[PDB]
Design an enzyme around this catalytic site. Structure first.
Site, short mmCIF file in Angstrom:
data_model
loop_
_atom_site.label_atom_id
_atom_site.label_comp_id
_atom_site.label_asym_id
_atom_site.label_seq_id
_atom_site.Cartn_x
_atom_site.Cartn_y
_atom_site.Cartn_z
N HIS M 61 0.86 -1.23 0.00
CA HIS M 61 0.00 0.00 0.00
C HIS M 61 0.87 1.24 0.00
N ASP M 91 10.67 22.35 -24.58
CA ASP M 91 10.57 20.98 -24.05
C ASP M 91 11.47 20.98 -22.79
N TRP M 126 7.15 -0.25 4.86
CA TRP M 126 7.77 0.43 3.68
C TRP M 126 9.19 0.93 4.06
N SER M 156 14.96 6.46 -11.75
CA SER M 156 13.99 7.20 -12.55
C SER M 156 13.90 8.66 -11.95
N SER M 157 13.74 8.78 -10.62
CA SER M 157 13.54 10.13 -10.06
C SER M 157 14.87 10.93 -9.99
N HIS M 240 12.80 11.38 5.55
CA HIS M 240 12.22 12.70 5.85
C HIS M 240 12.15 13.63 4.65
N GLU M 242 11.90 12.81 1.76
CA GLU M 242 10.84 12.24 0.87
C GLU M 242 9.47 12.76 1.25
N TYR M 244 8.69 15.64 2.29
CA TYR M 244 8.62 17.04 1.75
C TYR M 244 8.66 16.99 0.23
N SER M 255 -0.84 26.90 -4.46
CA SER M 255 -0.67 28.35 -4.67
C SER M 255 -1.34 28.74 -6.02
N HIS M 290 13.81 12.18 14.23
CA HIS M 290 12.47 12.13 14.86
C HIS M 290 11.68 10.89 14.53
N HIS M 291 12.22 10.06 13.60
CA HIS M 291 11.60 8.73 13.36
C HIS M 291 12.21 7.69 14.25
N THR M 316 6.32 26.93 7.20
CA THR M 316 5.06 26.29 6.71
C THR M 316 3.88 27.23 7.04
N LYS M 319 3.36 29.91 4.57
CA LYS M 319 2.58 29.56 3.37
C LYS M 319 1.09 29.46 3.66
N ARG M 438 0.81 0.27 15.45
CA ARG M 438 0.81 0.14 13.95
C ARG M 438 1.18 -1.27 13.56
C1 HEA Z 1 3.21 14.83 3.03
C2 HEA Z 1 3.72 14.12 4.02
C3 HEA Z 1 4.15 14.63 5.33
C4 HEA Z 1 4.36 15.93 5.76
C5 HEA Z 1 4.19 17.24 4.97
C6 HEA Z 1 4.71 15.81 7.10
C7 HEA Z 1 4.89 16.98 7.90
C8 HEA Z 1 5.40 16.90 9.23
N1 HEA Z 1 5.50 15.75 9.98
FE1 HEA Z 1 5.25 13.85 9.35
N2 HEA Z 1 5.06 11.91 8.68
C9 HEA Z 1 4.71 11.51 7.42
C10 HEA Z 1 4.30 12.38 6.35
C11 HEA Z 1 4.38 13.79 6.44
N3 HEA Z 1 4.63 14.52 7.56
C12 HEA Z 1 4.78 10.14 7.33
C13 HEA Z 1 4.51 9.27 6.12
C14 HEA Z 1 5.20 9.68 8.58
C15 HEA Z 1 5.47 8.28 9.12
C16 HEA Z 1 6.61 7.58 8.39
C17 HEA Z 1 6.52 6.11 8.86
O1 HEA Z 1 6.85 5.71 10.03
O2 HEA Z 1 6.07 5.31 8.00
C18 HEA Z 1 5.41 10.82 9.37
C19 HEA Z 1 5.97 10.71 10.70
C20 HEA Z 1 6.35 11.86 11.46
C21 HEA Z 1 7.02 11.77 12.70
C22 HEA Z 1 7.53 10.55 13.41
C23 HEA Z 1 6.51 10.09 14.47
C24 HEA Z 1 6.74 8.64 14.89
O3 HEA Z 1 6.90 7.69 14.05
O4 HEA Z 1 6.66 8.42 16.16
C25 HEA Z 1 7.13 13.09 13.12
C26 HEA Z 1 7.88 13.39 14.34
O5 HEA Z 1 8.26 14.55 14.44
C27 HEA Z 1 6.55 13.93 12.11
C28 HEA Z 1 6.40 15.36 12.22
C29 HEA Z 1 5.97 16.22 11.16
C30 HEA Z 1 6.06 17.63 11.24
C31 HEA Z 1 6.45 18.56 12.45
C32 HEA Z 1 5.64 18.04 10.02
C33 HEA Z 1 5.59 19.48 9.61
O6 HEA Z 1 6.34 19.64 8.33
C34 HEA Z 1 4.14 20.03 9.51
C35 HEA Z 1 4.37 21.58 9.49
C36 HEA Z 1 2.93 22.15 9.25
C37 HEA Z 1 2.22 22.81 10.21
C38 HEA Z 1 2.67 22.98 11.65
C39 HEA Z 1 0.82 23.28 9.80
C40 HEA Z 1 0.71 24.71 9.18
C41 HEA Z 1 1.15 25.87 10.06
C42 HEA Z 1 0.48 26.92 10.66
C43 HEA Z 1 -0.96 27.17 10.47
C44 HEA Z 1 1.32 27.94 11.50
C45 HEA Z 1 0.96 27.75 12.99
C46 HEA Z 1 1.51 26.44 13.62
C47 HEA Z 1 2.19 26.29 14.76
C48 HEA Z 1 2.55 27.48 15.66
C49 HEA Z 1 2.62 24.91 15.19
N4 HEA Z 1 5.98 13.16 11.15
CU LIG Z 2 10.18 12.84 9.17
#
Ligand code: HEA
Ligand SMILES: [Cu+2]
Ligand SMILES: CCCCC/C=C\C/C=C/C/C=C\C/C=C\CCCC(=O)O[C@H](COC(=O)CCCCCCCCCCCCCCCCC)COP(=O)(O)OCCN
Ligand SMILES: CCCCC/C=C/C/C=C/CCCCCCCC(=O)O[C@H](COC(=O)CCCCCCCCCCCCCCC)COP(=O)(O)OCC[N+](C)(C)C
Ligand SMILES: CCCCCC/C=C\CCCCCCCCCC(=O)O[C@H](COC(=O)CCCCCCCCCCCCCCC)COP(=O)(O)OC[C@@H](O)CO
Ligand SMILES: CCCCCCCCCCO[C@@H]1O[C@H](CO)[C@@H](O[C@H]2O[C@H](CO)[C@@H](O)[C@H](O)[C@H]2O)[C@H](O)[C@H]1O
Ligand code: CUA
Ligand SMILES: [Mg+2]
Ligand code: NA
Ligand SMILES: [Zn+2]
Lengths: 79, 227, 43, 58, 259, 49, 84, 105, 73, 144, 46, 98, 514
Positions: M61, M91, M126, M156-157, M240, M242, M244, M255, M290-291, M316, M319, M438
């Site tokens: 998945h 192109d 994964w 590829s990427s 990580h 990835e 982003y 946007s 943080h993972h 973030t 934006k 999980r």
């Molecule tokens: C598109 C995918 C994506 C994105 C953008 C993010 C964005 C972020 N993620 Fe996430 N994350 C995943 C996909 C993503 N994550 C996935 C797949 C996993 C698990 C991987 C796995 O184990 O398989 C994961 C796991 C993961 C963990 C590990 C947790 C664990 O396994 O125990 C953490 C820990 O810090 C984390 C944190 C964050 C943070 C801080 C952001 C930040 O970038 C978010 C920042 C955005 C905001 C905060 C919102 C907008 C802001 C405002 C409105 C301003 C005001 C806000 C404040 C003052 C706070 N994520």
């Molecule tokens: Cu991460």
């Protein structure tokens, strides 16, 4: 010297979550001490503290594997 | 353990778990408030026929929207890191217990004095006794003394596992070749459950942890009887 | 956006057919496997 | 050696509508067919090997 | 007719053949590792070689013979080559990270020391220092080749490039000999793993860069390069400097500091 | 001229709502789904030991 | 560090050819002497079947599965020691 | 930068230009309605007279519609602006959108 | 008849925005108050109240008599 | 009149309330009477009839502001159709339960749950707020 | 050249809506069915 | 020390590369490598936009440093104006043999 | 002609359309796997088998949704269609290498489907951690086929990223600086720099895993002095960045879509949005551990990763507030693409904020490896990357095809998907806080109510995915051809008509310097 041993005390040499080297160092220290004793004719009872500490900290299977390897001549640490 | 329809964390069994609940409450309000402010501002931007479509100056407003989030982050990070350094502080355990993860069950070793060790397996659903919890009970519980600082050391003899007990705020991975430490202190007697927390093959869902917290003298006699 | 009227209009009835065939194409094969799961397993 | 780049320039610029990978003449066609036959043939073979490896051998 | 300077490429079968060669090499390594057979893999290595040959042949046709590399096209290819080298630097960084992680914190199984108990490292002042002199020398001789080419001097370009390729080959033979003579192997724990995997990817890149310099040598013999337009030679000189710098980091890290 | 929504909007809204509510209520209450609600205020505890 | 060498004021091929034959190839010739001098076999160490070495968790995909790819009978023992 | 009075004066002068062309008339109204305001009567008056010099009755009407639209839900603004323009509407014979039925959906 | 008065014509969107951002702030404060009171303070007081006179040996005895333990009958 | 696909690069007409004066007239070809009305528009607009003014407006523009801004009943169709398809989903879930899921475990039988509930209370599960806190151990009943 | 325009810049035909419906059904339908048949395959094996 | 044997671009460049090198030598830019310098853009002095067909897209960066570019087709005929800033452009078609 | 056009393409539009078709097909595979997950969990007990088959399904998945649906659609599909048109380029810089980035994906996907067919599949997660993924606990070919699938997708990427960077830097009009390119083009360039630097690190780590499984190396095997935890660092040093990479091109489309349906000529605070995307790309490389907050790292290392992870909320938030300020004063057009973008803004904000919760290590001790993480990332992936994809697909579908969608059906599709993904994921926060792990095929009985509701949610999203296929069929069946589009002066990709001719910008735009 310090009986009523409950468990191994905090050791500032190994203050973090990973305690593997605490077990290993105490196992080494014990066996080094015991070699230094018995050898020089003295008494292994002076190595007792290291023995208590490694027994407390180390998984039974690690101790058992290291003991087998010391017997086989393949223990990689220096004693 | 968790109870049906539960929304939040299991009740705290340890002071550090209590700290986490109050720090979660603090953080969640923030989360609540920012999400609500965003949803509200969104509805505000979308509910008027008045327009202003010509170029808008961004510098003034970007200060507000960098500095206020920075301040909110510092207001989360201050208590977050206080708690982090608290759990890390030196505490003098009275007992050390090891647990080794296996596919699929935990073994426990209490070797401060005698060679006590045993395996701890899930009770199969067809063998539960009436009132016992499906996928949670074990044959041999991890009996421990209440109200005392205990050092738990965690490893594995095969693949990764992870040893967790949510009501005490505990989760330490079980990695072969490594000995990870955590501390445990229960404010209360009773039975405290957790479940293996790192994917480890066919029976990952089925190797739980049950701690049985009792007065010291009961723990000693139980230890002696388990030799 | 503006656009021309449909070159080949798809009436309510034709949309019902496209929608049904599209839903069946996902539902039937998965349904057949899940209906026969007990057969696959306690095989 | 002598510089015969001008001759290759005339050859590759000849207005015959050929794509560059076949513009050198009949040897390009041969090497193209050999490459594509090994790729497509090897790909069918790799599928055969998946079908084989997808079931136990016992 | 276009009135920009960029190259619209003719439709090409080589991207599909290279993609299929990748499937054939990987499914082939799978059949080799698990089903005791080299057949798929040899077919994929062959199609991969045929694909590269015809694709880069065609880039030479498009440039030297058809004139499509205007300055804007060449400048793209400069960026392309720089970015590709950056990605190869990050690929080696993952192996250096593996090496430092294991050597900086040697576990009990190794004897808790580096090099591990039972490992007898090569002396870095012997063949490894010789290999260092060899690749540094070949970075001096390619720079000579580059300046002769810019100065229009065909004979000294060929002489310096030949010397540079001969040193690449010498390093590759010295390495093959040190692999044979080494008393430890890739199965000798994390010391043999990091040593052979990191130096072995590096040796593969020395073979790739040497091949690329050989391609430039034969194009030069065919007069393809002008004194101002020779991007294939510059790219292969940048790739060659990359392989020399990766060697210097391996020499300092693994052969010297890790001995 | 009235469009699709003028002619059929009311009926689509009325019937989709009636149908949605009817089939969710039925699925939720009549086919043996065990929602496992809280025992609190609902279950009389019984001797287990 | 300038090195100890010393020039510019023009440029190019002639200087790098001077460096190739005056410094770089001499250094290779010197290291080649130094190497082919500490060459020729050193006494193989007693075999000890250490468990962190001679790893075998899956047979190799060549030979009898138990020999490394560039196995040298003289200096690479098998898991059971040097060959017969 | 500029007072409300200076903003209004520059727009009045823009539409009062005698030989303003059709393109400048559209550019001026399509820029002006991008701002956060309903244009003052004197700006609209000058735009309506530019329509007259360019012999374009329909665009005078559309300008009145866009004033009403820029007021959004402040329903008191448009009737006030029409009241202020009535002498110019009468002098130029401009019918309002309502008098033409063009307010009906 | 009477003339209509001149209404405000300028900055209508900015004015609506100013008014509502302030409204949204005031709400956030009045939510923060309620949230501290209904959730956070309530929790602190449940835990402080529970432990104030908590007797862990007596809790243990009740559990033991209920037969829940392996180690204690 | 008639917009063509091959006119995409030409200035085009658009009704939208933020671009009130579009780049071309809605209708550019004029009949004999429409040419006479455009000549009449050069004279005083007081002499145009209401119908003539409305005809000039509809030559210049397609829809009025009130037309182009009008609200529609589309929401009924969207919300109703979405509810239909959500209702259809519950059909799939009824089918799954009937033909795919087997019996759930015996630990959800009523007597098991009663006993497990007493045993959770006997071990004081979540005694601070979450579970046992809601039981009255003095009156032996759920707190009111 | 190649065909240009709506319905001609795609590798599938949209000349007939019903033949299109069949191809789209086979296309999306095969992607959605595949993991059920793989699960069936893993269950049958053992 | 040195001798010859390496062709120059003058001798051996061909195709488009040669066209570009030969035009640059004459100060000309038939393949649009350089950015055109603006005139004052009035109706008397419009930006003159070369083209080989009957229309070309213009992007107008109305003021220096604007990040927004305004795009429109410029057709053969009367000068047109940028719809944001009004500066004037006029198409000057033809040939590719300029 | 067919094979020359579609198997030998050197054309950025056609290869963009190939990536869109491939990503749509992958999306039906990832949707089926997600319904098998939620069928297993939708009532207590065992449906399919034990955790092996279940985590084979979970692992496939994720790989399918990430590598074969989201990355090909956003970067291969919208990046190839739009980027050249938005900078007036004829192109991509390397149009033939671009076609190999595409064709390496069907073989990568084939390897992944082979991994699940042979032996007992790769039930590793994964993240493919050893030793569960090593040759003793996952003997036989499945995990090596997964490693090879990831090598091909990685090449590829990486070649895609080289191509986009080069094109975006080198093929703009000579008067356009990088601060005159649209935000979607900045988001693809940044994402491509993240791909270029992060993929080679994953390639190194999974190669090490391959040699540990087949050449007797011991990078991650403590018996040889290796460390399983080293694999986790190399994997997450890529993993990580990835996430982003999966969101940034979504931020770029949001946007564009917000600006366009607010009737604005430009997004609010353009240079702030650029700064925000570069800061998030930069900070996304210094936070990976943080993972690994429960693996046993030192306390000061957990304090630094907590703080550096939180900081990403600042750019973030710029934006999100700038998207709000772009709606502000707009003439709001309530198109179905606009609804997807408004859903994105709010639901991405929810999942970013739960990410902020999780950045706190002391709390992450209890939330790690539970469904609270699953809820966090499906709010930013199923209700962020997916909403940006459906918003950009309905927005630009008439450009790519020349035909219009029925907007009423597209609004109905948005409404059903919005209810279904919130029903599916919202209750997983409760499951995670109360401790459900999980990667479990079954749960203690107390977790029943929220799992049942979450499974009912996933079926409503299945109905939305089926209706989407019908809506696309309807548009091609009715053939309503586009006539005019609004705001072309600030959306250059529409100015060559719909669809644009096979060659556009044969004569480049004229842009003067002044
Ligand atoms: C598109 C995918 C994506 C994105 C953008 C993010 C964005 C972020 N993620 Fe996430 N994350 C995943 C996909 C993503 N994550 C996935 C797949 C996993 C698990 C991987 C796995 O184990 O398989 C994961 C796991 C993961 C963990 C590990 C947790 C664990 O396994 O125990 C953490 C820990 O810090 C984390 C944190 C964050 C943070 C801080 C952001 C930040 O970038 C978010 C920042 C955005 C905001 C905060 C919102 C907008 C802001 C405002 C409105 C301003 C005001 C806000 C404040 C003052 C706070 N994520
Ligand atoms: Cu991460
Ligand atoms: C100057 C040396 C050049 C290498 C020549 C040898 C042949 C293989 C070439 C590839 C080299 C690259 C590294 C691959 C890993 C291992 C080879 C390491 C170098 C080497 O050759 O190591 C040898 C072992 O080789 C072995 O196992 C051989 C196993 C051979 C199979 C190769 C395995 C396939 C690797 C897959 C690569 C995937 C990469 C993906 C790219 C990333 C996408 C972005 C060392 O011999 P030994 O007997 O153990 O000790 C010497 C004792 N006297
Ligand atoms: C952690 C949480 C943080 C949340 C923070 C939220 C911040 C809220 C901020 C409020 C900003 C208030 C600005 C009001 C603008 C609304 C429209 C408007 O009112 O339009 C105009 C404002 O525009 C001007 O210039 C002044 C500025 C430039 C143009 C207007 C744009 C600024 C608006 C930003 C809107 C943000 C909305 C959503 C944010 C969440 C008014 O015209 P003026 O009289 O200035 O003309 C004078 C002409 N001169 C320049 C030549 C002198
Ligand atoms: C053991 C072997 C098996 C493994 C596979 C790899 C094998 C070895 C391959 C060696 C690489 C050979 C490259 C030959 C390229 C020839 C084409 C060329 O060099 O083309 C030049 C353009 O450069 C260009 O495309 C630049 C093209 C860049 C080429 C990139 C080269 C490196 C690629 C290697 C693949 C790395 C694998 C990584 C392994 C982990 C042509 O322009 P000019 O030179 O200016 O000429 C024009 C003038 O004549 C006009 O006056
Ligand atoms: C267009 C052209 C491209 C398409 C090419 C298609 C080629 C197909 C031929 C493959 O058949 C062979 O079968 C061998 C013998 O049957 C196998 O040996 C294998 O078979 C046995 C079982 O493992 C052992 O005896 C061997 O050692 C082992 O390598 C091995 O797979 C392969 O050589
Ligand atoms: Cu043990 Cu999961
Ligand atoms: Mg974990
Ligand atoms: Na289940
Ligand atoms: Zn302009």
């Amino acid at each position: 010297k310090i009986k009523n041993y409950q468990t191994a005390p905090f050791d500032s040499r190994f203050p973090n979550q990973n305690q593997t080297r605490n077990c290993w160092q105490n196992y080494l220290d014990f066996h080094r001490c015991e070699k230094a004793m018995t050898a020089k004719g003295g008494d292994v009872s002076v190595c007792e503290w290291y023995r208590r500490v490694y027994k407390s900290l180390c998984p039974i299977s690690w101790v058992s594997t290291w003991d087998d390897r010391r017997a086989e001549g393949t223990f990689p640490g220096k004693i | 353990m968790a109870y049906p329809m539960q929304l939040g964390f299991q009740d705290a069994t340890s002071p550090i778990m209590e700290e986490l609940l109050h720090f979660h409450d603090h953080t969640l309000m923030i989360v609540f408030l920012i999400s609500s402010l965003v949803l509200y501002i969104i509805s505000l931007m979308l509910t008027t026929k008045l327009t202003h479509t010509s170029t808008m100056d961004a510098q003034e407003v970007e200060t507000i929207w960098t500095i206020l989030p920075a301040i909110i982050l510092i207001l989360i990070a201050l208590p977050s890191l206080r708690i982090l350094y608290m759990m890390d502080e030196i505490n003098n355990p009275s007992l050390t217990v090891k647990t080794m993860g296996h596919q699929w069950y935990w073994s426990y070793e209490y070797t401060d004095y005698e060679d006590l060790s045993f395996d701890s397996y899930m009770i199969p659903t067809s063998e539960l006794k009436p009132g016992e919890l499906r996928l949670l009970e074990v044959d041999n519980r991890v009996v421990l003394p209440m109200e005392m600082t205990i050092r738990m050391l965690v490893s594995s003899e095969d693949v990764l596992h992870s040893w967790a007990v949510p009501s005490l705020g505990l989760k330490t991975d079980a990695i072969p070749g490594r000995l990870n430490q955590t501390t445990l202190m229960s404010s209360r007697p009773g039975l405290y459950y957790g479940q293996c927390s790192e994917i480890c093959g066919s029976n990952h869902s089925f190797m739980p942890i049950v701690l049985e917290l009792v007065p010291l003298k009961y723990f000693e006699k139980w230890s002696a009887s388990m030799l | 956006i503006t656009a021309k009227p449909a070159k080949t209009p798809t009436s309510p009835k034709e949309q019902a057919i496209g929608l049904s065939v599209t839903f069946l194409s996902f539902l039937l094969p998965a349904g057949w496997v899940l209906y026969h799961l007990d057969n696959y397993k306690k095989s | 050696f002598e510089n015969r780049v001008a001759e290759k320039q005339k050859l590759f610029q000849e207005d015959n509508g050929l794509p560059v990978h076949l513009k050198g003449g009949a040897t390009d066609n041969i090497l193209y067919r050999v490459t594509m036959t090994l790729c497509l043939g090897g790909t069918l073979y790799s599928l055969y090997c998946l079908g084989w490896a997808s079931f136990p051998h016992k | 007719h276009q009135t920009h300077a960029y190259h619209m490429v003719n439709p090409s079968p080589w991207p599909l053949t290279g993609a299929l060669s990748a499937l054939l090499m990987t499914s082939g390594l799978t059949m080799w590792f698990h089903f005791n057979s080299m057949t798929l893999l040899m077919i994929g290595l062959t199609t991969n070689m045929l694909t590269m040959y015809q694709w880069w042949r065609d880039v030479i046709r498009e440039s030297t013979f058809q004139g499509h590399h205007t300055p804007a096209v060449q400048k793209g290819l400069r960026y392309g080559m720089i970015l590709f080298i950056i990605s190869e630097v990050l690929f080696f960084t993952g192996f250096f990270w593996a090496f430092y992680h294991s050597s900086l914190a040697p576990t009990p199984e190794l004897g808790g020391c580096w090099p591990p108990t039972g490992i007898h490292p090569l002396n870095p002042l012997e063949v490894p220092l010789l290999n260092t002199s060899v690749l540094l020398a070949s970075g001096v001789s390619i720079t000579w080749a580059h300046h002769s080419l810019m100065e229009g001097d065909r004979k000294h370009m060929l002489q310096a490039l030949f010397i540079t390729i001969t040193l690449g080959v010498y390093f590759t033979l010295l390495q093959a000999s040190e692999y044979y003579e080494a008393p430890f192997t890739i199965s000798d724990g994390v010391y043999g793993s990091t040593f052979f995997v990191a130096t072995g990817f590096h040796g593969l890149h020395v073979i790739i860069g040497s091949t690329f310099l050989i391609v430039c040598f034969f194009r030069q013999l065919k007069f393809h390069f002008t004194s101002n337009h020779h991007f294939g030679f510059e790219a292969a000189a940048w790739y060659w400097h990359f392989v020399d710098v990766v060697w210097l980091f391996l020499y300092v890290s693994i052969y010297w500091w890790g001995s | 001229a009235p469009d699709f929504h003028d002619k059929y909007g009311n009926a689509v809204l009325a019937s989709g709502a009636t149908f949605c509510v009817a089939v969710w209520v039925y699925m939720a209450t009549q086919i043996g789904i065990e929602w496992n609600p809280s025992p609190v205020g609902r279950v009389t505890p019984k001797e287990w030991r | 560090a300038s090195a100890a060498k010393g020039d510019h004021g023009g440029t190019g091929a002639r200087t790098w050819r001077f460096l190739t034959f005056g410094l770089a190839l001499p250094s290779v010739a010197l290291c080649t002497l130094n190497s082919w001098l500490h060459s020729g076999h050193r006494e193989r160490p007693a075999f000890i079947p250490y468990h962190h070495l001679r790893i075998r968790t899956k047979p190799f995909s060549w030979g009898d599965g138990n020999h490394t790819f560039f196995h040298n009978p003289r200096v690479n023992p098998l898991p059971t020691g040097y060959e017969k | 930068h500029e007072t409300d009075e200076e903003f209004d004066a520059r727009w009045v002068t823009y539409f009062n230009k005698p030989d303003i062309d059709a393109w400048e008339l559209r550019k001026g109204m399509n820029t002006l309605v991008g701002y956060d305001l309903v244009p003052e009567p004197k700006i609209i008056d000058a735009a309506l007279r530019a329509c007259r010099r360019l012999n374009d009755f329909a665009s005078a009407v559309r300008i009145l519609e866009v004033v009403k639209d820029k007021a959004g839900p402040h329903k008191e603004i448009y009737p006030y602006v029409i009241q202020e323009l009535r002498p110019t509407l009468n002098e130029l014979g401009i019918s309002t959108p309502e008098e033409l039925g063009l307010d009906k959906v | 008849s009477t003339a209509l008065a001149k209404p405000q014509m300028r900055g209508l969107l900015a004015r609506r925005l100013r008014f509502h951002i302030v409204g949204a702030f005031m709400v956030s404060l009045g939510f923060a108050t309620f949230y501290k009171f209904a959730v956070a303070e309530k929790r602190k007081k449940a835990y402080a109240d529970f432990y104030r006179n908590y007797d862990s040996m007596k809790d243990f005895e009740e559990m033991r008599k209920a037969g829940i333990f392996q180690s204690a009958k | 009149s008639v917009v063509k696909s091959e006119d995409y690069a030409l200035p085009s007409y658009v009704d939208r309330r933020d671009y009130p004066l579009p780049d071309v007239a809605h209708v550019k070809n004029l009949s004999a009477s429409q040419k006479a009305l455009k000549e009449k528009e050069k004279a005083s607009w007081s002499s145009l009839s209401i119908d003539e003014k409305v005809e000039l407006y509809r030559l210049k523009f397609k829809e009025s502001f009130a037309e182009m801004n009008r609200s529609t009943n589309e929401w009924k169709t969207v919300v109703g159709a979405a509810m239909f398809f959500i209702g259809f989903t519950a059909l799939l879930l009824i089918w799954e339960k009937h033909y795919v899921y087997g019996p759930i475990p015996h630990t959800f039988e009523e007597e098991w749950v009663a006993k497990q509930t007493k045993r959770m209370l006997d071990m004081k599960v979540a005694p601070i707020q979450g579970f046992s806190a809601k039981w009255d151990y003095d009156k032996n009943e759920w707190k009111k | 050249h190649y065909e240009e325009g709506p319905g001609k810049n795609i590798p599938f035909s949209v000349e007939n809506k019903w033949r299109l419906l069949a191809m789209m059904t086979l296309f999306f339908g095969s992607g959605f069915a595949a993991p059920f048949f793989i699960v069936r395959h893993q269950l049958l094996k053992k | 020390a040195s001798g010859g044997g390496v062709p120059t671009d003058e001798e051996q460049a061909t195709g488009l590369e040669r066209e570009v090198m030969l035009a640059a030598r004459k100060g000309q830019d038939p393949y649009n490598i350089l950015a055109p310098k603006a005139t004052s853009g009035t109706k008397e002095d419009p930006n003159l936009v070369p083209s080989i067909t009957n229309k070309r897209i213009v992007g107008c960066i109305c003021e220096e440093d604007n990040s927004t570019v305004i795009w429109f087709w410029l057709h053969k005929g009367e000068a047109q104006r940028c719809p944001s800033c009004g500066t004037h452009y006029k198409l000057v078609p033809h040939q590719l043999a300029h | 002609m067919f094979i020359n056009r579609w198997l030998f393409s050197t054309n950025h539009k056609d290869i963009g359309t190939l990536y869109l078709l491939f990503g749509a097909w992958a999306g039906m595979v990832g949707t089926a796997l997600s319904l098998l997950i939620r069928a297993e969990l939708g009532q207590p007990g065992t449906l399919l088998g034990d955790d092996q088959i279940y985590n084979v399904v979970v692992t496939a998945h994720a790989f399918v949704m990430i590598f074969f649906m989201v990355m090909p659609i956003m970067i291969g599909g919208f990046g190839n269609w739009l980027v050249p048109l938005m900078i007036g380029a004829p192109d991509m810089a390397f149009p033939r290498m671009n076609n190999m980035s595409f064709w390496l994906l069907p073989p990568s996907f084939l390897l992944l489907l082979a991994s699940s067919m042979v032996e007992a599949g790769a039930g590793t997660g994964w993240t493919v951690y050893p030793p569960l993924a090593g040759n003793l606990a996952h003997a036989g070919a499945s995990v090596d086929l997964t490693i090879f699938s990831l090598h091909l997708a990685g090449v590829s990427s990486i070649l895609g990223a080289i191509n986009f960077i080069t094109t975006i830097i080198n093929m703009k009009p000579p008067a356009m600086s990088q601060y005159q390119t649209p935000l979607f083009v900045w988001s693809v360039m940044i994402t491509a720099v993240l791909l270029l630097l992060s993929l080679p690190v994953l390639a190194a780590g999974i190669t090490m895993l391959l040699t540990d499984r087949n050449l007797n190396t011991t990078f991650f095997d403590p018996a040889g002095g290796g460390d399983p935890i080293l694999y986790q660092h190399l994997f997450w040093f890529f993993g990580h960045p990835e996430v982003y990479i999966l969101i940034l091109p979504g931020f770029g489309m949001i946007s564009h879509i917000v600006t366009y349906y607010s009737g604005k000529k430009e997004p609010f605070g353009y240079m702030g949005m650029v700064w925000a995307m570069m800061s998030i790309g930069f900070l996304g490389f210094i936070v990976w551990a943080h993972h690994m907050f429960t693996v046993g790292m030192d306390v000061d290392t957990r304090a630094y990763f907590t703080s550096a992870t939180m900081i990403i909320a600042i750019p973030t938030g710029v934006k999100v507030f700038s998207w709000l300020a772009t709606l502000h004063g707009g003439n709001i057009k309530w198109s179905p693409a606009m609804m997807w973008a408004l859903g994105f803004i709010f639901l991405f904000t929810v999942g970013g904020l739960t990410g902020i919760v999780l950045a706190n290590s002391s709390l992450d001790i209890v939330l790690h490896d539970t469904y609270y993480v699953v809820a966090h990332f499906h709010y930013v992936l199923s209700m962020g990357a997916v909403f940006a994809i459906m918003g950009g697909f309905v927005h630009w579908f008439p450009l790519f095809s020349g035909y219009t969608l029925n907007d009423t059906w597209a609004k109905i599709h948005f409404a059903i998907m919005f209810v279904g993904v919130n029903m599916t994921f919202f209750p997983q926060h409760f499951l995670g806080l109360s401790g459900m792990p999980r990667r479990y095929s079954d749960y203690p009985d107390a977790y029943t109510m929220w799992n049942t509701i979450s499974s009912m949610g996933s079926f409503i999203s299945l109905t939305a995915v089926m209706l989407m296929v019908f809506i696309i069929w309807e548009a091609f069946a009715s053939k309503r051809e586009v006539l005019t589009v609004d705001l072309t002066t600030t959306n250059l990709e529409w100015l060559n008509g719909c669809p644009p001719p096979y060659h556009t910008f044969e004569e480049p735009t004229y842009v003067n310097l002044k």
